[PDB]
């Protein structure tokens, strides 16, 4: 596998990289992102978001800083946890969490976290140049239906999707002040105007849900979400673009995530040549438990063949994760091609998994 962001050899002399992201563009360009964790693995630290772009199918890469932090605090200023999408116009949107103080985004404050915001950038030239940062949360003019009891929120970490009519849907996570406690939940946001403005959906049925992605299936949203301390990825389905949810049994509890906290993973849809819609999930098996997050695996379900059990396709990273921070992954599928980026011992690695797709596609 190619080392895409190398802690030991990179243009920022960053000590560590985390939270990778990938989009395969229609024209065969590969666009990736990662947290530049300049000072080490810590989440609560000085972080910008890098891009790496390839026009030769992942042989060589161009690097840039896609989004800088607010530069307020040289210890704690951070933009992080990229969620991305390509719209029907080809526009590339990136949404990041922004903070500049110490302490967990969800749990530190009992009121709206004062240094918190959600920052958005877009590219109209296939990720060559970006807009200025747009602040989605400083006022009420960009994101409708934000709960008054919001502590904070950011994207679900991974990729969003486009509905048939062109509506953009992004996975999100929120922290809500409820009866003297902070509870965190998954949900979605959507845009009908190419990302200019958004509406927030409602929270999923269970707290302790966070990082997630959704696919579209026949107008429904199906979510695969990190469900902390359950030992598995939860799955829910919405028939009303994220207003209401119920358990989605065929995926709920089917991907096991081992002892301790959950882990980010990715969940995408592919349509094979026989017309079957398949779901692909990347996540660590975490057989060793907690933050070890060993064995980043790829799993498959066939929505058009639900009595067939979820199958492990391959294990792109058959190694222990680094306990300081590892395990995260992102798939992208486009035009019969499949690629993954994942965390590997403080680096980001890249693999083309198209050969595995060919095995599934049968042919
Ligand atoms: C913004 C942030 O803090 N993101 C980090 C996230 C998070 O802290 C964890 O979901 C716990 O959030 C809650 C809701 O309690 O989780 C990771 O620390 C991890 O590797 O698990 C890496 C990731 O950048």
From TrEMBL:
Catalytic activity from the UniProt record: Hydrolysis of alpha-(2->3)-, alpha-(2->6)-, alpha-(2->8)- glycosidic linkages of terminal sialic acid residues in oligosaccharides, glycoproteins, glycolipids, colominic acid and synthetic substrates
GO cellular component: cytoplasm; membrane
A single GO molecular function term of this UniProt record: exo-alpha-sialidase activity
InterPro entries cross-referenced by the UniProt entry: Sialidase, Sialidase_fam, Sialidase_sf, Sialidase_trypan
Pfam families given in the database record: BNR_3
Keywords per UniProt: Glycosidase, Hydrolase, Repeat
EC number(s) reported in the record: 3.2.1.18
KW Repeat (keyword) present: yes
Domain Sialidase: 27-286
GO biological process: ganglioside catabolic process; oligosaccharide catabolic process
Family recorded in the similarity comment: Belongs to the glycosyl hydrolase 33 family.
PANTHER family in UniProt: EXO-ALPHA-SIALIDASE, SIALIDASE
Entry protein name: exo-alpha-sialidase
Organism phylogeny: Bacteria, Bacillati, Bacillota, Clostridia, Eubacteriales
């Amino acid at each position: 596998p190619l080392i895409l962001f190398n802690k030991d050899n990179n243009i920022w002399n960053s000590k560590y990289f985390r939270i990778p992201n990938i989009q395969l563009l229609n024209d065969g360009t590969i666009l990736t992102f990662s947290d530049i964790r300049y000072n080490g693995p810590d989440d609560h630290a000085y972080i910008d978001i890098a891009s790496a772009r390839s026009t030769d199918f992942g042989k060589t890469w161009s690097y840039d800083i896609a989004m800088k932090n607010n530069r307020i605090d040289s210890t704690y200023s951070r933009v992080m946890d990229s969620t991305t999408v390509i719209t029907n116009t080809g526009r590339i949107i990136l949404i990041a969490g922004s903070w500049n103080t110490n302490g967990n985004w969800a749990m530190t404050t009992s009121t709206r976290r004062s240094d918190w915001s959600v920052q958005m950038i877009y590219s109209d030239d296939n990720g060559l140049t970006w807009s200025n940062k747009i602040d989605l949360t400083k006022d009420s003019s960009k994101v409708k239906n934000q709960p008054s009891n919001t502590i904070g929120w950011l994207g679900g970490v991974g990729s969003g999707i486009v509905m048939d009519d062109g509506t953009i849907v992004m996975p999100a996570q929120i922290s809500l002040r409820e009866n003297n406690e902070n509870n965190y939940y998954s949900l979605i946001i959507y845009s009908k105007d190419n990302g200019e403005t958004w509406t927030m959906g409602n929270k999923v049925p269970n707290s302790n849900t966070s990082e997630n992605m959704v696919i579209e299936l026949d107008g429904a949203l199906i979510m695969s979400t990190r469900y902390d301390y359950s030992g598995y990825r939860a799955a829910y389905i919405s028939h009303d673009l994220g207003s209401t949810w119920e358990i989605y049994e065929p995926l709920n509890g089917k991907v096991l995530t081992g002892k301790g906290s959950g882990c980010q993973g990715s969940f995408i849809k592919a349509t094979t040549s026989n017309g079957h819609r398949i779901g692909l999930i990347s996540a660590p098996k975490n057989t060793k438990g907690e933050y070890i997050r060993d064995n980043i695996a790829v799993y498959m379900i066939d929505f058009d063949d639900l009595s067939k059990r979820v199958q492990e396709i391959c294990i792109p990273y058959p190694k222990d994760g680094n306990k300081l921070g590892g395990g995260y992954s992102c798939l992208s599928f486009k035009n019969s091609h499949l690629s993954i980026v994942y965390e590997a011992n403080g680096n980001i690695e890249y693999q083309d998994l198209t050969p595995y797709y060919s095995l599934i596609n049968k042919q």
